[PDB]
Symmetry: D2
């Protein structure tokens, strides 16, 4: 049998870490479906390295890695298109987007062309993203003015600047401390990570913006994957699909529980009004799309495919028009 390392973030606690839930289910399913020929050894807590280093590991050694935007975006910045604010109207749309969409199919091939690595699946490990901060209630974009937010990656920085704040990239493993010591005022993440990182200890205000879909990415070493027998490759694919489905089911049924847990720990929870959500969208969405095409140089095809796959084919044209004089 062949044993592969599987690295991911957060503690080996199923209740508190949806990525651990996925990793554990994947280990069980891979070992079963390959009749024990492939075994996974779990390395939680980002113990083998932070995001850049774990990408290097999976690209160059027979292993698996669960990466965030921090790991993947320097190599495939085209993933930024999937984080257009308010791209997905519901969970179903995101599922269809990643499972069958032409854009994501190309993202997968692009990662393989550039590094050899295989993007095997998209792990839902939280609900839609919310904001937290320690300074003041945030109910609308205007309330960001002057604040400094921690960013996972440059796309978060772009969003914060669109709202009047500033942003700084800080690794996940240093985010609690950054917030504790006021290096940053706030961050963004689904309830799952806000709980997992105990961010409620160092953040008072939770804003239910539901601005982006929460995901991480299962990556496999290319040489290993391509040398599998077809039988084992098909087994791995089925195991990934099943574990992915299990995570979607579990995350979605726990979102409201997790938000109420944050309230029960003392966080002040703000539910933006319709107008406030419209303001987040109008301030955030066209500015983000402009950032994609200008600073990030992403061509129209990449964006159009994604919009089609999500069911909002007109957002690019509408953003261009909003700004046309």
């Amino acid at each position: 049998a062949t044993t592969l390392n599987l690295s991911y973030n957060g503690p080996p606690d199923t209740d508190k870490n949806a990525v651990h839930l996925f990793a554990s289910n994947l280990k069980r399913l891979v070992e079963e479906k390959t009749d024990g020929d492939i075994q996974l050894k779990l390395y939680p807590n980002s113990m083998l390295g932070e995001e850049q280093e774990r990408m290097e590991q999976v690209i160059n050694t027979p292993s698996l890695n669960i990466a965030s935007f921090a790991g993947l975006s320097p190599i495939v910045p085209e993933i930024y298109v999937s984080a257009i604010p308010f791209l997905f109207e519901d969970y179903e749309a995101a599922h269809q987007f990643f499972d069958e969409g032409d854009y994501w199919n190309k993202v997968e091939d692009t990662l393989e062309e550039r590094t050899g690595a295989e993007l095997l699946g998209v792990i839902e490990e939280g609900g839609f993203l919310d904001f937290t901060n320690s300074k003041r209630p945030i109910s609308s974009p205007e309330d960001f003015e002057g604040l400094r937010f921690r960013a996972m990656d440059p796309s978060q920085v772009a969003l914060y600047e669109a709202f009047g704040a500033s942003g700084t990239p800080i690794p996940w493993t240093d985010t609690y401390m950054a917030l504790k010591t006021n290096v940053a005022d706030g961050q963004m993440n689904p309830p799952m990570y806000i709980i997992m990182g105990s961010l409620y200890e160092v953040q008072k205000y939770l804003t239910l913006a539901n601005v982006q879909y929460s995901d991480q990415f299962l990556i496999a070493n290319g040489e290993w994957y391509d040398d599998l027998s077809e039988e084992n490759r098909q087994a791995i694919e089925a195991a990934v699909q099943e574990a992915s489905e299990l995570n979607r089911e579990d995350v979605e049924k726990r979102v409201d529980e997790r938000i109420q847990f944050l309230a029960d720990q003392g966080m002040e929870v703000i539910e933006p009004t319709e107008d406030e959500l419209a303001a987040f969208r109008e301030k955030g969405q066209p500015a983000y799309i402009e950032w994609l095409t200008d600073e990030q140089g992403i061509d129209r095809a990449w964006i159009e495919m994604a919009l089609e796959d999500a069911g909002q084919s007109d957002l690019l044209a509408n953003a261009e028009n909003l700004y046309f004089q």
Copy 2:
């Protein structure tokens, strides 16, 4: 409005050139669905160049090109997997393979990665491929031994070698002359091309092997295509699919009529027996797969993906 060149092979006669049928329907459909914003100008009969040059043209200038294996295989040799002999039991199996298969998705992305150009569709422009020659009837693999065939591309060379014949690449636009002057004894193509090139004038023996699916590939310049608006992109995509369906329907209806035409021009037509067809498969198919895997060195993962698409995993 923008006007783009569309280059392709064969004379601009829609009844004798299934590629011109496709190009003409595509032009009509693109102009309609874009309300004139995108116009196509047809450059038939390979007038702008042979296959390599036309690939260079489409890669580097806003334009479209319909390419054969000869033009595409040097850039994406992985397309050879789609030409495994007897891979498709019928037209429907081939359509599902290209329309839905994972392997073809990867081929499309690989072209764009290597050149920027976009592979927009797979044009069915003849029935399954047959053999012609000027030396003797061919009814079994053994009848190839010693003959020298014209090849479109290296994958045909491999197939010919599997049957004991030699093969050499010669452009389509020199194929009539190559056969007339006996630079080669034979070639392979669907009836459509055998008629189109008047090859029955210089070939006597036709073998209905139906050995490979006949296709060509619609390619668009990437810088142009990938900056189109959503409206124009969707229009072109819809036009391509529609034109592709119209070609499949037309080609499939006319295969038997085209064979009849060849017989009328004096070709001696052999329809191999069930047993002879099995022999062609049992010699040609595993030899071709070994050529893919162990001679050309195309990685197994590519091949296995295509076989899964085709419902033929058993072949490897």
Copy 3:
């Protein structure tokens, strides 16, 4: 005439920022040698973004960027070979290695093939790298044991781990606070950066290890550069060479005074013994070279090329055997 933005780290203070010295000289020289046809506008303080964002900007918009390993290594990890510990015995060895070596020429081509961007030069913006920390004096590799260091990029993590320390990547613009709040015990940089980031206010011990060459990388947008007239391209090349020379001259002259400044601010300055320096090298080199080949997937041809350029070809087989 045209105007291009040039982004880089640190304040627009020549005395405290050798990258600003370079940017200022390059601005002056480019304007002069192009007879005003190309003008540079200076964007210091990393104001247009941290390292990843700025690489995206220079790849996709007509502009120039001065990038660190943090910006470039995710795209061209082959640059890690140039940071093998103690690869360069003196500044001159590094100058010829980057200016004309076959390895660096291939790195240049690799960046261009992957992104279109042009690696115009290697800016010397400090002396050789030293260590700082707040916990204890470091004189031998063993003194790293149990410490946690801030890393610019994964190559520093690998070096730390070779000495029994841990490493955490933290952007430059948050490194002072990471040290103040004890997220990390230490970091590594030449005296220039230790001063520029005021790290002496939050670090006590300075070890003069002189372990790696300090550089950053001048990158130009590809479409912009390739569309220049031949005259202007040559003018830019000349300006880059001259500004690079000016920086080498200034940085090298000022290393000792910068160490004096750090001592005067209260840092305890330690020079490892010859035995200890040998131990740093004997432990650091083979571990680093194994990291290049194993974890980073860098093939033998790449490492071989760099070692030949550096006059150190035997290190690869030695790290293997």
Copy 4:
């Protein structure tokens, strides 16, 4: 030990095939300098396939291949810049260009980046290229008008068209028969190939245009090459350099004798004057450079780098 196939065109006859001279010297020197660790098995006469087939072999399997423009140009069209008509005044100009030039270094790196394969050397296997045909003598660019030439690759098609001829790509191994049967009227190659393919039997007219540098390209599978030890890497490099220089010396000394052999077989030879060459340059050079930038998408930067390396 490792036995690698080395594929190339033409018969295993040292006297009649400069590529066999090279391949045989390479085998000898590679096995000596690696103390037997690397052994070559020679496959002359394009036995393992024509140009396209062999390129895929070397890209994907441990092996070596000597490729022409026909094999390399679909993958690295940037090689077309090295074939600008009249780019090189003499052999030494060409040698400096390929040996030291920035443009060629970029070509080498580009092949590796796209395919993993390593371009180890530029083999001189004939003198500068000449024109042959069976229809009429060529002394003026206008003599090409109405002729149909065989092309190795699209760059020859472009050159023929610049002069008013047509061109069609036909593999080397079919060129003799294409000319015999008048599928084509003419072709271009150095005297070495005109002799090797017996083209003098099917061509009457030879013009010593010396219009392009004759080369082929030694390519090695990347996975194999870039994992070599410093010792074996330096050994292969030294063998390639030594064998390359042996070919340059032998080819250059034999050009005049090879031309005389062709005259002795009945070919009518025209040796253009400086004024005649100027007319070919005026009609061929500007059109070719425009074709590079327009149709082939090769940018100004690549072309100017090459012109500088060539001292133009």
